[PDB]
From a paper:
The mFo-DFc map depicted clear density for the tryptophan residue that had adjusted into the structure by adopting a similar conformation to that of the phenylalanine residue it replaced. Per residue rmsd of the region around the Xe3 binding cavity was calculated between the F209W mutant and the StPurL-Xenon complex and it was found that mutagenesis at position 209 resulted in a local readjustment of the structure. To accommodate the larger tryptophan residue, side chains of amino acids in close proximity of the original phenylalanine residue like Glu186 and Leu182 residing on helix α7 readjusted adopting alternate rotamers. The surface exposed lysine residue, Lys608 residing on a loop spanning residues 601–613 which, lines the Xe cavity has the highest overall residue rmsd value of 1.7 Å. This loop showed maximum perturbation of the backbone in the mutant structure and is a part of the long linker region (601–631) that connects the B1 and the B2 sub-domains. Other residues in this region with average rmsd over all atoms greater than 1 Å were Glu184, Glu186 and Lys196. This result demonstrates that local perturbations in structure can translate into movement of residues in the outer shell of the cavity by propagating adjustments in surface residues and that cavity 3 exhibits structural plasticity. Out of the three internal hydrophobic spaces marked by xenon atoms, the region around the third xenon site was found to be most malleable and tolerant to mutagenesis. This site was more surface exposed and although mutation of F209W resulted in perturbation of the local environment, the changes were tolerated as is evident from the crystal structure.
FGAR-AT encoded by the purL gene is a multidomain bi-functional enzyme that catalyzes the fourth step of the purine biosynthesis pathway. The FGAR-AT protein from [name] (StPurL) has 1295 amino acid residues and is a single chain protein with three major domains. The C-terminal glutaminase domain produces an ammonia molecule that is consumed at the coupled active site present in the formylglycinamidine ribonucleotide (FGAM) synthetase domain where nitrogen is incorporated into an FGAR molecule converting it into FGAM. While the FGAM synthetase domain and glutaminase domain carry out the two enzymatic reactions within this bi-functional enzyme, the function of the N-terminal domain is not clearly understood.
Residue numbers in the entry: -9 to 448, 466 to 1295
The structure:
């Protein structure tokens, strides 16, 4: 029995959970203790759960809560032995696990559960340790920024203390004069300048009353660099001359020059451009039926950063970087839908233990920030965690490491990224009539949509918190709103970000020309102790603010309750330009201000600065040889394979991904840009690419900015766009403002792109952001040390795509071919600030640059001509690592060799191979060489174009210069060297057995890559005679909160002839839908409940513990002809419903992958013989499918049960390796399932559950790789057509 004790006015139940760490993780902890000379004999860990109860549980309810808290892999249980150390979230914080677990308990009828929380009990046997050594063990077992260690289970009562509300505090300006403001500036950390204090002193002296702490804090956050963008609005004097434009006005110059296709710039928290008229697919409000709505799907774009918080706590730093940016996209106009993301990281050197590289030197770091390696281990996991649980694919990115002592603009100093760049961005779609914000009527209701707040954000104040499923529930309300078209009730919406409601609400009513009257105690709160300052100014996540007409509140409440999206009306818009915040608890008014006070500011800044310019130093080549440089450059993280950043993030949710990072049958992550379809019924789409080249700014500020723009365009150039004016840019500027030379260099770089290169090319920059404190200082010896970033412009390019099918990738063909270099460097072959210089600890002399603007435009326009005429077999641009890395990566992606001659590229073979000038390599059919050279010559490119040679079958990578061999190596050896960084990252972050299997597989050149064998005609629509009758059977497309894959599931059943109906679990609980009216149902994928309490478990136990809904599902599954499919999260849910499903007694559980990591893979499976009616006709076929899950490993009770499942013949799909054999080796089997199993059916074949996603790849265009001869339908369309034909 579980523990039960008094806890304040409540009772606290303590429930023992399952064992918490796998064998490999226990071994790593033992190894770390041994490495610290901590003599630890054994460690075992178990989860422990704490339930704060507001009322007692009866026996039945106690058994339900016990069953809710049974989840996870069935690991080795041990009797507790040794010293207990209980690690929990810090008191005063509430984990996201708690928010979601508590939501499951309430949706299971346990309203007595006020809050659930979890810790980890470690039992350590180490009898000889001293007291100081026990503190070191404790330090090893928790994150000091987020957790605490306790010595008894009962200490967890500290996490549930209820504090009385703290009152507002007055700052006594009337009674003390200006010193009260000086004291408050220090006490509250307002970082006010003297002229900011003068402004506040006069404003309150004029009002004749003391400011409250909340009103000072709100104003300080509104007037910070971060929020007010004073540097980008400043006036400048440079070298003694006043300049005519601010940095923002030079950005806006690009929209004054090129307004084409722009629908919204600089007036929302994303830009919008024109898209394409296509079928937007969603379920109608009245009927619940999914349908296509033919209309423009315009395209929104935004890119943000989260640099400071990621230096302190990288997982939530990066997660809430993604999360914040997703809210900016959904809050565009009057509501919009995010569709695909991008991610970037810049960090200092990794210094992976046991894999030190020769250019890396430990310079030390501040105590209070984490290392570059910790950022790259936990940060990409947090950004992926948000994109995967919210449900947007993450399809392009960058990752740079840089940290070196260099002779730059301010002479010799350390330049790097101890404060990293953490960048998150994406694209979304929006309806034309919702692009413009609406008018806010006087008396509009002012709402906060989203998460109850806590005291987050005000280094503890820099530790963020992410709950992506809350954001998905809010996106579903936003989507119901814009799907109502003219009846959309949102008049105005805005994300909540910096400053919390203290910035978002004043900005909302101000942007509508109104004031606002608000009620503090109507805001939802999970921390009753919070003061009015903490309630109004915290930066809790997953919130939006909205205005809605009072007469639309009943509709808005219906939409929210159906999605389980929390919301509160907290105020009313007023005609008076005033802002007031009242407190019904203290019967007072924490804020009472004219908006022109609140939104008043100090004068415009002037920045008077001078130019600094480094003299470059020629590269010292004494210890450089071509062969050693190839090996070093392939080991630079910036160049090396990025799998560890790619397969951790879904790349298929939505079913609209055409081109992801992984390319070809060997799934090599070298795609130069991302492409999505605009709908599920079109080949129009959208593309995203990134350019960045920060190390060049250590030699030439403007050259680094022009190369960022040029590389974004060379990355996107082999996608079918047409007019260069379709491409729109985000410009994200990271600098150390104030550091010598960086200010004049920022202005020079903004002018270089905004006044010069982008207007000359026809490129708009309609959105951007800036982060202006990119440096770190600490005391290292008893000496001051500093690490300052280069000026770091990241350009993201976004474009409407005219046909996604015509995109080229770096996969070489071995058909008769020609490789052509387009060298936009014009033979300059610069080596300054290249990966070659960096790997020999140098900066060099002169960097690359845009050498000829008309030739850059001509190269783009020539590429677009060649793409549209279908004249290219492959493209890959030149960037980090030069021509050598471009050619190596094309041979990796084509799994072949190259024979290249570089005698035309200069006598300096090192510079010809390793310069990072713009350009790239095209591959064409040999019969088309002369035509393509003439086409390039009509764009002015003839002297830039050079025939290099040919791609050849086999494994030789050969570069010659006339009769001399310059470099020759096995392509497999190069490919494995270029994989060693991801190998080492995966092996320190994930199960090392799996990291090792994936790496070693790359060294087998005989791998034939993904390949297909089909047992049926993929073009035969067996459902066509039924569709032609017009009789369309319904399918219940089942979703729970946190499901994210329902739209494409409905679209696959719709193509097979069904009427797809949106059935939320709330519809079944509210009686709006009854399963008796359906003959088919599908449980869809995603992250219901964030997978807390085990993937699929909350959704299944919600059904089981409501007897009415339980019986509905049992009745459905017991009818004689009904069909059901569960995919991914649906598979997990239905495996937890066995008890309701006949013929399911042998089904396994689905638990954490053996790798211990989310796996987003394009995996090969074979269809096996089973009763499944949904796989009729397909037995023996082998083809790839989208895999995207963290808990897909089949787990049985013991081998008796595996053998029985097998002998009953219910396995319907198995993972196979590329040789065709059933496998458990990773990642060909991505999850470790026994015998490759990844789909099972019932004895009667009418219910099938599977972990992969056929509905993400039912369109050939959405398959990462596929045979060239396939038509619109992939093989997986046959599952949906078999369901239609079976219904008859
Ligand atoms: N941080 C990241 N997250 C996700 N994908 C990434 C990341 N960094 C790089 N990638 C992807 O890895 C591949 C190789 O990246 P990279 O070599 O930096 O591209 P390029 O050199 O073409 O600019 C590309 O498909 C890129 O989108
Ligand atoms: Cl019980
Ligand atoms: Cl990702
Ligand atoms: Cl059945
Ligand atoms: Cl499960
Ligand atoms: Cl088979
Ligand atoms: Cl393909
Ligand atoms: Mg690259
Ligand atoms: Mg590229
Ligand atoms: Mg790049
Ligand atoms: Mg065409
Ligand atoms: Mg119930
Ligand atoms: Mg694979
Ligand atoms: Mg194996």
């Amino acid at each position: 029995g579980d523990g039960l004790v008094p806890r304040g006015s409540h009772m606290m139940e303590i429930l023992r959970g399952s064992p918490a760490l796998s064998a490999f993780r226990i071994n790593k902890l033992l190894a770390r203790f041994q490495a610290a000379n901590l003599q630890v004999h054994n460690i075992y860990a178990e989860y422990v759960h704490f339930a704060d109860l507001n009322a007692p549980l009866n026996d039945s309810e106690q058994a339900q809560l016990t069953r809710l808290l049974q989840y996870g892999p069935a690991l080795s249980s041990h009797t507790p032995a040794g010293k207990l150390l209980l690690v929990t979230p810090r008191p005063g914080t509430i984990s996201p696990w708690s928010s979601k677990a508590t939501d499951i308990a309430h949706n299971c009828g346990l309203q007595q559960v006020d809050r659930l929380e979890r810790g980890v009990a470690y039992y350590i046997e180490a009898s000889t340790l001293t007291a100081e050594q026990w503190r070191q063990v404790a330090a090893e077992l928790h994150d000091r920024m987020m957790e605490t260690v306790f010595s008894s289970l009962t200490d967890a009562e500290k996490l549930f203390i209820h504090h009385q509300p703290a009152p507002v505090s007055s700052v006594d300006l009337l009674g003390e004069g200006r010193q009260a403001l000086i004291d408050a500036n220090l006490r509250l950390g307002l970082a006010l300048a003297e002229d900011e204090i003068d402004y506040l002193q006069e404003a309150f002296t004029k009002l004749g009353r003391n400011p409250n702490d909340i009103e000072l804090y709100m104003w300080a956050q509104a007037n910070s660099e971060h929020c007010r963008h004073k540097i980008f609005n400043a006036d400048w004097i440079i070298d003694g001359k006043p300049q005519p434009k601010s940095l923002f006005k030079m950005i806006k110059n690009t929209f004054e020059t090129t307004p084409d296709y722009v629908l919204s710039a600089y007036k929302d928290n994303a830009a919008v451009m024109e898209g394409s008229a296509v079928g937007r697919y969603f379920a109608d409000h009245n009927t619940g039926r999914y349908d296509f709505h033919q209309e423009p799907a315009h395209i929104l774009m935004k890119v943000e950063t989260h640099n400071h918080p990621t230096a302190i706590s990288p997982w939530p730093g990066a997660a809430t970087g993604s999360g914040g940016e997703i809210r900016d996209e959904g809050a565009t106009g009057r509501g919009a839908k995010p569709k695909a993301g991008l991610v970037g990281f810049s960090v200092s050197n990794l210094r992976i233990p046991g894999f030190e590289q020769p250019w890396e030197e430990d310079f030390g770091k501040p105590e209070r920030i984490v290392t570059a390696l910790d950022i790259m281990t936990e940060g990409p996991l947090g950004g992926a965690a948000f994109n995967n649980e919210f449900g947007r694919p993450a399809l392009t990115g960058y990752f740079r490491t840089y940290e070196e002592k260099v002779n730059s603009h301010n002479g010799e100093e350390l330049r790097g990224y101890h404060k990293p760049i953490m960048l998150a961005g994406g694209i979304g779609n929006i309806r034309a009539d919702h692009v413009q914000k609406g008018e806010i009527v006087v008396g509009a209701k002012l709402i906060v949509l989203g998460g109850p707040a806590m005291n987050i954000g005000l280094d503890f104040a820099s530790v963020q918190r992410d709950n992506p499923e809350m954001e998905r529930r809010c996106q579903e309300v936003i989507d119901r709103c814009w799907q109502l078209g003219d009846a959309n009730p949102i008049l105005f919406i805005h994300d909540v970000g910096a400053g919390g409601l203290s910035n978002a609400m004043p900005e909302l009513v101000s942007d509508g020309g109104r004031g606002g009257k608000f009620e503090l105690r109507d805001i939802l709160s999970d921390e009753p102790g919070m003061s009015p300052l903490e309630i109004w100014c915290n930066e809790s996540q997953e919130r939006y603010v909205l205005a809605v007409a009072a007469d639309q509140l009943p509709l808005f409440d219906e939409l929210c309750k159906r999605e389980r999206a929390p919301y509160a009306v907290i105020g009313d818009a007023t005609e008076e330009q005033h802002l007031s915040l009242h407190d019904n608890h203290f019967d007072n008014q924490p804020i009472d201000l004219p908006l022109d006070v609140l939104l008043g500011k100090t004068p415009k800044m002037t920045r008077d600065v001078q130019t600094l310019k480094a003299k470059g130093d020629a590269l010292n080549r004494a210890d450089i040889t071509i062969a050693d440089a190839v090996k070093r450059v392939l080991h630079l993280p910036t160049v090396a394979e990025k799998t560890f950043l790619v397969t951790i993030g879904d790349r298929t949710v939505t079913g609209m991904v055409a081109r992801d990072q992984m390319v070809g049958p060997w799934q090599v992550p070298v795609a130069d840009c991302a492409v999505t379809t605009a709908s599920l019924d079109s080949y129009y789409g959208e593309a995203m690419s990134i350019g960045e080249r920060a190390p060049v700014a250590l030699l030439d500020f403007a050259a680094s900015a022009r190369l960022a723009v040029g590389e974004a365009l060379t990355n996107i150039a082999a996608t079918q766009i047409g007019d260069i004016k379709r491409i729109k840019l985000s410009a994200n500027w990271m600098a150390a403002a104030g550091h010598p030379g960086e200010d004049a260099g920022l202005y020079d770089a903004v002018k270089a792109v905004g006044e010069e290169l982008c207007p000359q090319l026809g490129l708009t920059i309609p959105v951007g952001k800036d982060s202006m404190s990119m440096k770190t200082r600490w005391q290292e010896g008893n000496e001051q040390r500093e690490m300052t970033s280069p000026l770091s412009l990241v350009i993201s390019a976004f474009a409407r795509v005219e046909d996604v099918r015509h995109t080229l990738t770096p996969q070489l063909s071995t058909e008769d071919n020609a490789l052509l270099l387009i060298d936009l460097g014009k033979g300059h072959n610069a080596l300054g600030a290249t990966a070659l210089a960096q790997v020999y600890r140098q900066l060099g002399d002169k960097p690359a640059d845009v050498r000829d603007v008309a030739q850059l435009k001509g190269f783009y326009d020539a590429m677009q001509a060649l793409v549209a005429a279908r004249k290219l077999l492959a493209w890959h641009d030149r960037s980090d690592g030069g021509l050598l890395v471009t050619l190596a990566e094309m041979a990796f992606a084509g799994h072949c060799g190259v024979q290249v001659d570089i005698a035309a590229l200069g006598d300096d073979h090192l510079a010809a191979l390793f310069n990072e000038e713009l350009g790239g390599v095209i591959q064409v059919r040999a019969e088309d060489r002369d035509a393509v050279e003439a086409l390039l010559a009509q764009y002015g490119l003839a002297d830039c174009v050079h025939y290099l040679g040919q791609a050849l079958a086999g494994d030789r990578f050969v570069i010659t210069a006339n009769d001399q061999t310059v470099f020759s190596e096995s392509r497999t050896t190069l490919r494995v060297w270029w994989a060693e960084t991801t190998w080492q990252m995966q092996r320190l972050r994930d199960n090392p057995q799996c990291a090792d299997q994936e790496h070693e597989a790359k060294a087998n050149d005989t791998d034939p890559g993904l390949n297909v064998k089909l047992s049926f005609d993929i073009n035969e629509d067996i459902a066509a005679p039924y569709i032609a009758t017009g009789a369309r059977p319904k399918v219940a497309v089942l979703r729970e909160q946190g499901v994210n894959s329902h739209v494409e599931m409905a679209a696959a059943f719709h193509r097979a002839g069904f009427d797809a109906i949106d059935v939320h679990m709330s519809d079944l609980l509210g009686g709006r839908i009854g399963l008796g009216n359906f003959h088919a149902l599908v449980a869809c994928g995603g992250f219901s409940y964030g997978d807390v309490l085990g993937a699929g478990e909350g959704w299944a136990k919600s059904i089981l513990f409501n007897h009415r809904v339980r019986d509905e599902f049992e009745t459905f599954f017991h009818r004689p002809q009904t069909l059901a499919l569960g995919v991914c999260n649906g598979c997990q849910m239905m495996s937890n419903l066995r008890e309701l499903i006949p013929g399911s007694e042998l089904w396994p559980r689905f638990v954490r992958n053996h790798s211990d990591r989310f796996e987003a893979r394009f995996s090969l499976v074979e269809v096996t013989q089973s009763p499944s009616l949904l796989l009729q006709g397909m037995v023996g076929s082998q083809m790839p499918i989208a895999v995207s899950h963290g808990e897909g490993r089949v787990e049985v009770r013991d081998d008796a049960h595996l053998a029985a499942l097998e002998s009953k013949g219910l396995v319907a799909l198995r993972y196979v390796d590329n040789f065709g054999k059933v496998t458990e080796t990773y990642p060909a089997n991505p999850n470790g399932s026994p015998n490759g199993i990844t789909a099972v059916t019932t004895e009667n074949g009418r219910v099938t559950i599977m972990m992969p996603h056929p509905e993400r790849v039912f369109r050939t265009v959405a398959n990462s790789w596929h045979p060239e001869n396939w038509g619109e339908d992939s093989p997986w369309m046959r599952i949906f057509r078999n369901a239609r034909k079976q219904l008859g």
